[PDB]
Amino acid sequence: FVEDWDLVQTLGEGAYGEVQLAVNRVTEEAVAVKIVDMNIKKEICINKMLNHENVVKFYGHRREGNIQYLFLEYCSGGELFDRIEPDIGMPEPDAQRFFHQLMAGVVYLHGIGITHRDIKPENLLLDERDNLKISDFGLATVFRYNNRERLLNKMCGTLPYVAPELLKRREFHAEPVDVWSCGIVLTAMLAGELPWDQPSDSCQEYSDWKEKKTYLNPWKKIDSAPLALLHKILVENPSARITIPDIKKDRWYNKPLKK
Numbered sequence: 342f343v344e345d346w347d348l349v350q351t352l353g354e355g356a357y358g359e360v361q362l363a364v365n366r367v368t369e370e371a372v373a374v375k376i377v378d379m380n381i382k383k384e385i386c387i388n389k390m391l392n393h394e395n396v397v398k399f400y401g402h403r404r405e406g407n408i409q410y411l412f413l414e415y416c417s418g419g420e421l422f423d424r425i426e427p428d429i430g431m432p433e434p435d436a437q438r439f440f441h442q443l444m445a446g447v448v449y450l451h452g453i454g455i456t457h458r459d460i461k462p463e464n465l466l467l468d469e470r471d472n473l474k475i476s477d478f479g480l481a482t483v484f485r486y487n488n489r490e491r492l493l494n495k496m497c498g499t500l501p502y503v504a505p506e507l508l509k510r511r512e513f514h515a516e517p518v519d520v521w522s523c524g525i526v527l528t529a530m531l532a533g534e535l536p537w538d539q540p541s542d543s544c545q546e547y548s549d550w551k552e553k554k555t556y557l558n559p560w561k562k563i564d565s566a567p568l569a570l571l572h573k574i575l576v577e578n579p580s581a582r583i584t585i586p587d588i589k590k591d592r593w594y595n596k597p598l599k600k
C-alpha cells in the first residue's frame with residue numbers, strides 16, 4: 342500500500358493545469374503533484390538534474406493518456422509572492438534571508454549550466470521552515486555544456502522581471518538575465534511593488550531609474566544599503582552588471598540583520 346496516494350487539496354494552477362497536494366496512504370508523506378493537460382519533456386529532463394536545498398526536488402513523473410503528472414517536493418509555505426505586502430514589501434531581515442537563499446539556488450543552477458529564465462516571486466516557494474525553493478522549470482534551459490557557453494536568443498520570461506538586453510538584442514548571455522530578475526524580486530520584497538512594466542526605452546519608470554531619480558517610489562522606500570546593491574544589479578549593460586560572486590561581497594548582502 343506504500344505506493345498509494347490520496348489527492349487531498351488543490352494548491353495552485355499553472356498555464357498547463359493545476360498543482361495538487363498528495364498524501365501517502367501509509368507514511369503520510371506529502372508531495373506536490375503538477376498536472377499538465379497535454380515543453381514538458383524538457384522540463385522533466387532538467388528537473389532530473391536538480392539536487393539542491395534551495396531548488397524544489399523532483400521525485401518522478403507519470404503519463405496517463407494526454408495528461409502528464411509531475412511529482413515534486415511539497416512546499417507548505419506557498420509562494421514568496423504571498424509574503425509580499427502590497428506597497429510595503431516585508432521586513433528587511435526577512436528579505437535579506439530570502440535573497441541569500443535565492444542566490445544559493447541560482448549559484449547552484451548556474452554551476453550545473455542551467456538558467457531558469459523565469460525567476461519571480463510566484464516561482465519561489467517556501468517550505469515549512471520558510472526556506473526558499475526555486476520552482477517551475479518549464480522555461481529553463483542549458484546555457485553551458487562540456488564547459489562551453491551557449492548564448493541565448495529566445496525571448497521568454499515575464500515582462501516586469503526580464504532584463505533589457507532580452508528585449509533589444511538578438512543574442513545574450515544567460516547568467517546576467519537571471520541576476521537581473523533576482524534584482525527585481527529584491528525590489529518587490531523591499532517595496533511591495535514592481536518598478537516598471539518592462540525595461541524598455543519607452544517605459545517612463547525605467548527611464549526615471551536610468552536617470553537616477555531615486556527620490557521616487559519604489560526606490561524611496563528602500564534603505565540606502567540594499568538600494569546600493571540594486572544600483573549594481575539593475576544595470577542596463579549586461580556586461581557591466583554585477584555578477585553573483587560580487588553580489589556576495591556587497592555591503593548590504595553581508596550586513597548582519599534581525600527583527
Ligand SMILES: NC(=O)c1nnc(N[C@H]2CCCNC2)c2cc(-c3ccc(Cl)cc3)sc12
Pocket residue numbers: 352353354355360373397413414415416417418419420463464466476477
Ligand atoms: N512544489 C510545490 O509544493 C508547489 N508547486 N507549485 C505551486 N504553485 C505554482 C503555481 C504556478 C506558479 N508557480 C507556483 C505550489 C503552491 C503551493 C501552496 C502551498 C500551500 C498553500 Cl496553503 C497554497 C499553495 S505548494 C506548490
